[PDB]
Amino acid sequence: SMSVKKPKRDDSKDLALCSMILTEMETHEDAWPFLLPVNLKLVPGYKKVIKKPMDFSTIREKLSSGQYPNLETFALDVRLVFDNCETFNEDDSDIGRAGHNMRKYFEKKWTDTFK
Numbered sequence: 001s002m003s004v005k006k007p008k009r010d011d012s013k014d015l016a017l018c019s020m021i022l023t024e025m026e027t028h029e030d031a032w033p034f035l036l037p038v039n040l041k042l043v044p045g046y047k048k049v050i051k052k053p054m055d056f057s058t059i060r061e062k063l064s065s066g067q068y069p070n071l072e073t074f075a076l077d078v079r080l081v082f083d084n085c086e087t088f089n090e091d092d093s094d095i096g097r098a099g100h101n102m103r104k105y106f107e108k109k110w111t112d113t114f115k
C-alpha cells in the first residue's frame with residue numbers, strides 16, 4: 001500500500017532474457033507454423049474466428065520496440081500464439097502437435113529462467 005512495499009525484485013535483465021527465450025522458440029524445428037502472421041486473405045475463417053492473431057515475428061517486433069511493459073505481458077502474447085493454434089487446428093494434425101510441443105518448450109524455459 002502507500003509507503004509499504006515488498007522487497008524490489010531485480011527486473012533489469014528481463015528484456016534480454018525474454019529475447020533469449022524468443023530466439024530459442026524461433027529456432028525450434030517445430031516453429032514453422034508460428035514464425036509469421038497467418039495470411040488472413042488466404043486462410044478462410046481465420047479473420048472471423050481468431051479475434052487476436054499473434055505470431056513470433058509480431059512478438060519480436062513488440063519486444064524490440066518497448067511495447068511490453070513487463071515480462072508477464074510478454075508471456076501472455078506467447079501463450080496467445082498457442083491458444084490460437086488450439087482454437088483453429090485439430091490436435092491430431094502437424095500444426096496442432098507443433099503447438100502443443102512449442103507450448104511445453106516455452107513453459108519450461110519460462111519456469112527455469114524466472115521461477
